[PDB]
């Protein structure tokens, strides 16, 4: 079931690149099953078995997981040319759907957006999984209301303006700086994708963060949300909320702004 038959596939257009090769879009032929819309991950020296171990060490660690805001693994195929096939979030990265439409979409699915998000990482947890990169640019967007968490490539150069502190000091990855990291999330989608820290050396976003100065509120963020980010970046991470608190909490932000 993991492996799958090439003669399945029909690879079509390039949609992005990867860092093992090219990423594109096409249909899954599915046995006795309608045809599904997939992202194909190609790679150009998996020739070399060494590669291809390191290729498809994504692929194992996807296998395990089944949820909806999750990008689902459907397959691999083994042979040269070796693919990892995926569920495909037609839509796109989440930063691009998000700069584009800065004066279009509305504040309710801005928080539908992180709400969702903090249900795949309650999940994550619940797995024992850390994840170790969560940002905007790791999110794809299913359709205008459902977003997926999409890049694996860290889990169980270094994202240091999203990374909690104890991260960058001792090299500590718990569930409590995957809220840090999903607070700068939250931080991006309510800023229409721009990035945190912009025009900063990430040296001086160490000091920084050692001094106490945070992100600051992203102009008509409710201030509820903000102050549920300010949480997320406790310096101690006993002090943060824990992912099951951020989803309830959400999801009452969420309901504040549907009622107007
Ligand atoms: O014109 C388009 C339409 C379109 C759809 C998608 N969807 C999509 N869904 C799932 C995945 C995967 F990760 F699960 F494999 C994926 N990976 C390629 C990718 C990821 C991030 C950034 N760039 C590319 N991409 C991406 C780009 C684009 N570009």
Redesign the pocket.
């Given at each position: 079931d993991y492996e799958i038959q090439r003669e399945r596939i029909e690879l079509g257009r390039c949609?992005?690149e990867?860092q093992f090769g090219d990423?594109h879009?096409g249909i899954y032929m599915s046995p006795e099953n309608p045809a599904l819309a997939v992202?194909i991950?190609t790679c150009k020296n998996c020739t070399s078995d060494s590669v291809r171990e390191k290729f498809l060490q994504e692929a194992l660690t996807m296998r395990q997981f089944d949820h909806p805001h999750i990008?689902k693994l459907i397959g691999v195929i083994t042979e040269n040319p070796v693919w990892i096939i995926?569920?495909?979030?037609?839509?796109?990265?989440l930063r691009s759907f998000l700069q584009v439409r800065k004066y279009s979409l509305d504040l309710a699915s801005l928080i539908l957006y992180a709400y969702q998000l903090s249900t795949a990482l309650a999940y994550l947890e619940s797995k024992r999984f850390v994840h170790r990169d969560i940002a905007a640019r790791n999110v794809?967007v299913s359709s205008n209301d459902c977003v997926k968490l999409?890049?694996f490539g860290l889990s169980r150069k270094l994202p240091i303006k999203w990374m909690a502190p104890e991260s960058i000091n001792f090299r500590r990855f718990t569930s409590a700086s995957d809220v840090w990291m999903f607070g700068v999330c939250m931080w991006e989608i309510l800023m229409h994708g721009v990035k945190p820290f912009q025009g900063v050396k990430n040296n001086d976003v160490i000091g920084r963060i050692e001094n106490g100065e945070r992100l600051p509120m992203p102009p008509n963020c409710p201030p509820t949300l903000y102050s549920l980010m300010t949480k997320c970046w406790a310096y101690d991470p006993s002090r943060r909320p824990r992912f099951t608190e951020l989803k309830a909490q959400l999801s009452t932000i969420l309901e504040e702004e549907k009622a107007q």
């Amino acid at each position: 079931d993991y492996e799958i038959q090439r003669e399945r596939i029909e690879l079509g257009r390039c949609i992005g690149e990867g860092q093992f090769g090219d990423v594109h879009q096409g249909i899954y032929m599915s046995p006795e099953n309608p045809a599904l819309a997939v992202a194909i991950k190609t790679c150009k020296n998996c020739t070399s078995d060494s590669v291809r171990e390191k290729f498809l060490q994504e692929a194992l660690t996807m296998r395990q997981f089944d949820h909806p805001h999750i990008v689902k693994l459907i397959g691999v195929i083994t042979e040269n040319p070796v693919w990892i096939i995926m569920e495909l979030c037609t839509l796109g990265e989440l930063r691009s759907f998000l700069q584009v439409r800065k004066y279009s979409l509305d504040l309710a699915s801005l928080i539908l957006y992180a709400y969702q998000l903090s249900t795949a990482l309650a999940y994550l947890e619940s797995k024992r999984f850390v994840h170790r990169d969560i940002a905007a640019r790791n999110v794809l967007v299913s359709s205008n209301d459902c977003v997926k968490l999409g890049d694996f490539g860290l889990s169980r150069k270094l994202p240091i303006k999203w990374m909690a502190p104890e991260s960058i000091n001792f090299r500590r990855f718990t569930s409590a700086s995957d809220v840090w990291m999903f607070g700068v999330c939250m931080w991006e989608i309510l800023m229409h994708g721009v990035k945190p820290f912009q025009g900063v050396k990430n040296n001086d976003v160490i000091g920084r963060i050692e001094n106490g100065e945070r992100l600051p509120m992203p102009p008509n963020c409710p201030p509820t949300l903000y102050s549920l980010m300010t949480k997320c970046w406790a310096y101690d991470p006993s002090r943060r909320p824990r992912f099951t608190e951020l989803k309830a909490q959400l999801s009452t932000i969420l309901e504040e702004e549907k009622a107007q």
